[PDB]
A paper describes a structure:
The heterodinuclear Mn/Fe cofactor is found in the R2 subunits of subclass Ic ribonucleotide reductases (denoted as R2c) as well as a related group of proteins known as R2-like ligand-binding oxidases (R2lox). Although the physiological function of R2lox proteins is not known, the cofactor catalyzes formation of a tyrosine–valine ether cross-link in the protein scaffold. Two proteins from this group have been characterized to date, homologs from Mycobacterium tuberculosis and Geobacillus kaustophilus. Both contain the ether cross-link, and both co-purify from heterologous expression hosts with a long-chain fatty acid ligand bound in a hydrophobic channel leading from the protein surface to the active site, hence the name ligand-binding oxidase. The two metal ions are bound next to each other in octahedral geometry by two histidines and four glutamates, with the manganese ion occupying the N-terminal metal-binding site 1.
Crystal structures were obtained of all three R2lox point mutants in the non-activated reduced and the oxidized resting state by soaking apo-protein crystals with MnII and FeII under anoxic or aerobic conditions, respectively. In contrast, the bulky isoleucine side chain in V72I-R2lox has a larger effect on Y162 than on the metal-coordinating residues. It seems to have displaced the Y162 side chain, particularly in the reduced state. Both I72 and Y162 were difficult to place in the electron density. Aside from these two residues, however, the structures of V72I-R2lox are practically identical to the wild-type structures in both redox states. Interestingly, it appears as if the ether cross-link was formed between the hydroxyl group of Y162 and the Cβ of I72 in the oxidized state. Although the model with an ether linkage is more convincing than other models with different rotamers of the two residues, because the electron density is ambiguous, we used mass spectrometry to verify if the cross-link is present. More mass spectrometry samples were consequently prepared in the dark. The Y162-I72 cross-linked peptide was obtained by digestion of aerobically Mn/Fe-reconstituted V72I-R2lox, but only if the samples were processed in the dark, whereas the cross-link was not present in V72L-R2lox. Therefore, an isoleucine in position 72 allows cross-link formation, but makes the link more susceptible to destruction by photoactivation.
Residue numbers in the entry:
A (entry chain A), B (entry chain A): 4 to 286
């Protein structure tokens, strides 16, 4: 270290990421350990085997995603720390702790309903793996040796704009469209509501990061759009795979009179993807 | 990634670091933004210039240390993440967020009392710089390329056993011995109480980390002792420098009838150092 900002000066109290950090502390008190999952255990046990499975693809996607994101944010925190972006780092401590609670929430649900011993990796197809097993850690880990604006934009695009701003947001919507209607899994849905609220700050950090780089040179806008489009095939290829699992196993939909509109879910994904694009201004 | 623990299985709910993570969430709700510093501003302004300075060396040491530690824990989190130690990572998200709040607390105090514009690096002598500007980032950053048991023990020794378990603990004691007696700076002392409570978990993570490595091969015990002793000269060399500043500027002690026992503070430092050693068992 050559010096310390809070010895030479203070935190930059007006910095957007300090304000986001402050909001994260105010809004981040929830604890997955307090969620009552006992009704969820009864719901899951009440289900037939073919209804039991209906929910597992989505939980498998979230549980791996939360865990990937918990591990893979560390290089972003490092890169920004090394750039002396102290307020970003303070905020990223809330981001990382949020994702830890997200991992915890889904794992507590799996334990409570009796599937913790079940290996849910069978529900990760090639497109999911390309995003979460490969493209996400590649883009983040790159920041250890290459913290160029190109690398940081690509990292924020994959992590915050695609994984969180497209897939996670759409998954929260899907959970609600399906189980909130069914009256099922109230503990899980309480957790989803807290995850979704945290996610708002995570996406805003991505937007801030990408926009501040675009702000220095509008040609980075083109890079942002390009990286969004490179991942789209895998995003929809996973969505299509989940859709086809749902269409092939309809008993939960039948039993609970959910006219599950998979083409409305698909449209919600397309819509999320397009509005994330629109939250980055070329100028 | 080759897979995900919370897809194949669950969190290891009995893991000591998951239990420490759970305690951190329960005990880590405090927010520096809620501390009332208005009485602290009046106290500081009431002081003469020569009393004003008396407190600044210690705040300078803490503010830089909190900031160093916030940046320099990231490689430990990374190394353990890459080892698949998921429960350690979950706990480290609380550790990192705690230190962010510590940075925030001291910087809020500096702002409130009117010294935020003052560059307090003048109170970092060569021994302080050797620990915080050099040895700490060197030991932590090494973990990016070398996560051997030797490297991890050395990192935990410098960070958790020396910086936190010797210097920080002794600084908390010193703040209380001096200002809690004077009736001064109630907001700062509220913050110190919260820092000290957080620190308990940070030191326990260090103990767990060092002991689990020693447990695999008792020869690492010798390394631990050696790394403790290598840093001791700098620890006491900074303590002696602070002591001599205090002896050379006594007006706060006089004004507030603090018979400040600098040789009792020195003994407290020696005692902390020796009991950290004793918390690691050769077997
Ligand atoms: C059937 C419609 C498809 C809806 C899309 C569902 C997407 C599943 C979500 C899995 C990825 C979750 C990523 C977590 C991100 C974070 O924790 O910030
Ligand atoms: C006059 C007696 C000397 C007492 C020793 C005072 C030591 C000052 C403390 C500065 C280091 C603080 C390190 C912070 C560690 C953490 O935040 O985990
Ligand atoms: Fe997120
Ligand atoms: Fe600490
Ligand atoms: Mn395909
Ligand atoms: Mn010396
Ligand atoms: Mn999440
Ligand atoms: Mn601290």
């Amino acid at each position: 270290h050559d010096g310390f900002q809070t010895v030479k000066a203070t935190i930059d109290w007006e910095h957007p990421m300090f304000k986001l950090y402050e909001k994260a502390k105010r809004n981040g008190k929830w604890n997955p350990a307090d969620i009552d999952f006992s009704q969820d255990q009864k719901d899951f046990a009440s289900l037939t085997s073919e209804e039991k499975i209906s929910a597992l693809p989505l939980v498998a996607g979230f549980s791996a995603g939360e865990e990937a994101i918990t591990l893979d944010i560390l290089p972003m925190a490092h890169a920004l720390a090394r750039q002396g972006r102290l307020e970003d780092v303070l905020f990223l401590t809330t981001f990382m702790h949020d994702e830890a609670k997200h991992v915890e929430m889904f794992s507590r649900w799996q334990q409570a309903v009796g599937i913790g011993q079940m290996d849910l990796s069978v529900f990760h197809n090639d497109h999911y793996k390309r995003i979460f097993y490969e493209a996400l850690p590649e883009a983040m880990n790159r920041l250890y040796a290459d913290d160029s604006p190109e690398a940081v934009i690509r990292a924020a695009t994959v992590y915050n704009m695609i994984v969180e701003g497209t897939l996670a947001e759409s998954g929260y919507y899907t959970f609600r469209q399906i189980y909130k209607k069914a009256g099922l899994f109230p503990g899980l849905l309480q957790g989803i509501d807290y995850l979704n609220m945290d996610e708002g700050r995570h996406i805003q950090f991505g937007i801030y990061t990408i926009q501040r780089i675009v702000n220095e040179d509008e040609r980075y806008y083109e890079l942002f759009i390009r990286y969004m489009d490179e991942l789209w095939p895998h995003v929809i290829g996973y969505v299509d795979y989940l859709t086809e699992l749902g269409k092939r196993q309809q008993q939960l939909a039948r039993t609970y009179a959910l006219e599950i509109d998979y083409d409305l879910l698909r449209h919600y994904v397309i819509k999320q993807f397009n509005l994330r694009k629109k939250q980055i201004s070329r100028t």
